[PDB]
Amino acid sequence: GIEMKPHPWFFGKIPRAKAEEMLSKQRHDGAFLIRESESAPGDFSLSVKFGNDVQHFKVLRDGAGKYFLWVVKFNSLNELVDYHRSTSVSRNQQIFLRDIEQVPQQPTYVQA
C-alpha cells in the first residue's frame, strides 16, 4: 500500500473522542495508540480497546525520574509497549498491544 514507516505510536493530542471512536471501530482486542498530551510535557496515555470500550493507561512521569504506568518502570515507551506485550496489561484477562493499523495490503488491483 502506501504505509510509510509505521510511526510508534504517535497520535498527536488526538481528541479523546476521535481516539476512542475509531479505536473502538477496532474488531479484535489489542488496538492501541499513544496520544501526546496537548501542552503537558512527557504525558502519554496508552489507549487500548479493552472490550466493551476503550481503556487508557496514563503513562505517568516521575515516580523515580521515569515513566511508569502503575508499577514497573521504564525509560522507553518501547520498553513499555514491549513490556506489556508478553504479559498484557491487565489481570482481568489477556491483553496484547497491536498496531492500531491494518497492514497497507495491496490497494486496488489484485496480483499484478
mmCIF file of C-alpha atoms in Angstrom:
data_model
loop_
_atom_site.group_PDB
_atom_site.id
_atom_site.type_symbol
_atom_site.label_atom_id
_atom_site.label_comp_id
_atom_site.label_asym_id
_atom_site.label_seq_id
_atom_site.Cartn_x
_atom_site.Cartn_y
_atom_site.Cartn_z
ATOM 1 C CA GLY A 1 0.000 0.000 0.000
ATOM 2 C CA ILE A 2 1.171 3.435 0.971
ATOM 3 C CA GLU A 3 2.108 2.999 4.587
ATOM 4 C CA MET A 4 5.464 4.610 5.100
ATOM 5 C CA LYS A 5 7.408 3.525 8.130
ATOM 6 C CA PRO A 6 4.865 2.812 10.873
ATOM 7 C CA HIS A 7 5.215 5.527 13.456
ATOM 8 C CA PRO A 8 5.361 4.127 17.015
ATOM 9 C CA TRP A 9 2.901 5.060 18.252
ATOM 10 C CA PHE A 10 2.026 8.627 17.858
ATOM 11 C CA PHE A 11 -1.377 10.190 17.705
ATOM 12 C CA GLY A 12 -0.662 13.795 18.477
ATOM 13 C CA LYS A 13 -3.027 15.005 21.144
ATOM 14 C CA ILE A 14 -5.707 13.182 19.251
ATOM 15 C CA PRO A 15 -9.115 14.170 20.671
ATOM 16 C CA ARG A 16 -10.113 11.731 23.368
ATOM 17 C CA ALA A 17 -13.159 11.222 21.225
ATOM 18 C CA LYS A 18 -11.547 10.605 17.867
ATOM 19 C CA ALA A 19 -9.275 8.234 19.713
ATOM 20 C CA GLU A 20 -11.949 6.219 21.420
ATOM 21 C CA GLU A 21 -14.169 6.496 18.394
ATOM 22 C CA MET A 22 -12.059 4.956 15.683
ATOM 23 C CA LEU A 23 -10.016 2.995 18.179
ATOM 24 C CA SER A 24 -13.371 1.482 19.114
ATOM 25 C CA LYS A 25 -14.139 0.651 15.499
ATOM 26 C CA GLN A 26 -11.460 -1.990 16.097
ATOM 27 C CA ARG A 27 -12.621 -5.521 15.654
ATOM 28 C CA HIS A 28 -10.418 -7.686 17.795
ATOM 29 C CA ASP A 29 -8.704 -6.782 21.014
ATOM 30 C CA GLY A 30 -5.391 -5.042 21.381
ATOM 31 C CA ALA A 31 -5.552 -1.909 19.294
ATOM 32 C CA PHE A 32 -3.668 0.946 20.827
ATOM 33 C CA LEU A 33 -2.368 4.425 20.391
ATOM 34 C CA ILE A 34 -0.275 6.805 22.379
ATOM 35 C CA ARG A 35 -1.724 10.257 22.293
ATOM 36 C CA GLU A 36 0.544 13.144 23.075
ATOM 37 C CA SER A 37 -0.854 15.449 25.689
ATOM 38 C CA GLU A 38 -1.690 18.861 24.337
ATOM 39 C CA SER A 39 0.606 21.140 26.269
ATOM 40 C CA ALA A 40 1.645 18.770 29.022
ATOM 41 C CA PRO A 41 5.248 17.577 28.794
ATOM 42 C CA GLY A 42 6.015 13.875 28.917
ATOM 43 C CA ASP A 43 2.397 12.955 29.342
ATOM 44 C CA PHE A 44 1.483 9.836 27.454
ATOM 45 C CA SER A 45 -1.615 7.719 27.688
ATOM 46 C CA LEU A 46 -1.735 4.302 26.130
ATOM 47 C CA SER A 47 -5.175 3.525 24.838
ATOM 48 C CA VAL A 48 -6.401 0.016 24.271
ATOM 49 C CA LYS A 49 -9.664 -1.444 23.149
ATOM 50 C CA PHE A 50 -10.247 -3.392 26.309
ATOM 51 C CA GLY A 51 -13.557 -4.713 25.089
ATOM 52 C CA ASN A 52 -16.807 -3.009 25.924
ATOM 53 C CA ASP A 53 -14.912 0.214 25.450
ATOM 54 C CA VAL A 54 -11.613 1.994 25.225
ATOM 55 C CA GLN A 55 -9.246 1.962 28.144
ATOM 56 C CA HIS A 56 -6.430 4.361 28.765
ATOM 57 C CA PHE A 57 -3.207 3.987 30.660
ATOM 58 C CA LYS A 58 -1.676 7.187 31.898
ATOM 59 C CA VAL A 59 1.999 6.605 31.419
ATOM 60 C CA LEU A 60 2.860 8.950 34.220
ATOM 61 C CA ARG A 61 6.156 10.670 34.696
ATOM 62 C CA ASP A 62 8.327 10.992 37.762
ATOM 63 C CA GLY A 63 7.980 8.197 40.278
ATOM 64 C CA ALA A 64 11.725 7.935 40.171
ATOM 65 C CA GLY A 65 12.504 10.281 37.307
ATOM 66 C CA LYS A 66 10.949 7.920 34.768
ATOM 67 C CA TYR A 67 7.764 6.816 33.112
ATOM 68 C CA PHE A 68 5.574 4.322 34.874
ATOM 69 C CA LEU A 69 2.032 3.166 34.359
ATOM 70 C CA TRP A 70 1.233 1.640 37.705
ATOM 71 C CA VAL A 71 4.418 -0.019 38.815
ATOM 72 C CA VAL A 72 7.067 -1.403 36.545
ATOM 73 C CA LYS A 73 9.433 1.301 35.448
ATOM 74 C CA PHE A 74 10.832 2.059 32.044
ATOM 75 C CA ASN A 75 12.965 4.610 30.306
ATOM 76 C CA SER A 76 11.444 3.994 26.884
ATOM 77 C CA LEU A 77 7.881 3.624 25.762
ATOM 78 C CA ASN A 78 9.147 0.829 23.576
ATOM 79 C CA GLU A 79 10.122 -0.899 26.777
ATOM 80 C CA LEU A 80 6.555 -0.275 27.873
ATOM 81 C CA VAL A 81 4.752 -1.261 24.723
ATOM 82 C CA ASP A 82 7.121 -4.205 24.818
ATOM 83 C CA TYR A 83 6.764 -4.958 28.487
ATOM 84 C CA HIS A 84 3.026 -5.148 28.084
ATOM 85 C CA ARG A 85 3.465 -7.398 25.087
ATOM 86 C CA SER A 86 4.071 -10.746 26.711
ATOM 87 C CA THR A 87 2.256 -10.133 29.957
ATOM 88 C CA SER A 88 -0.503 -7.989 28.593
ATOM 89 C CA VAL A 89 -1.613 -5.128 30.772
ATOM 90 C CA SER A 90 -4.472 -6.466 32.826
ATOM 91 C CA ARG A 91 -5.005 -9.388 35.132
ATOM 92 C CA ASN A 92 -8.712 -9.411 34.362
ATOM 93 C CA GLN A 93 -7.721 -11.272 31.239
ATOM 94 C CA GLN A 94 -5.166 -11.336 28.477
ATOM 95 C CA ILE A 95 -4.366 -8.184 26.592
ATOM 96 C CA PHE A 96 -1.954 -7.629 23.767
ATOM 97 C CA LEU A 97 -0.693 -4.484 22.138
ATOM 98 C CA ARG A 98 -1.184 -4.474 18.410
ATOM 99 C CA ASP A 99 -0.681 -1.835 15.786
ATOM 100 C CA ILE A 100 -3.851 0.178 15.579
ATOM 101 C CA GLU A 101 -3.433 -0.032 11.832
ATOM 102 C CA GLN A 102 -4.238 -2.853 9.482
ATOM 103 C CA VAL A 103 -1.442 -3.616 7.063
ATOM 104 C CA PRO A 104 -1.319 -1.497 3.895
ATOM 105 C CA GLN A 105 -2.217 -4.579 1.875
ATOM 106 C CA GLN A 106 -2.307 -4.103 -1.864
ATOM 107 C CA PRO A 107 -4.700 -1.236 -2.601
ATOM 108 C CA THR A 108 -6.663 -1.815 -5.753
ATOM 109 C CA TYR A 109 -5.713 -4.420 -8.296
ATOM 110 C CA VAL A 110 -5.128 -7.948 -7.148
ATOM 111 C CA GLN A 111 -1.993 -9.723 -8.219
ATOM 112 C CA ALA A 112 -0.137 -7.890 -10.925
#
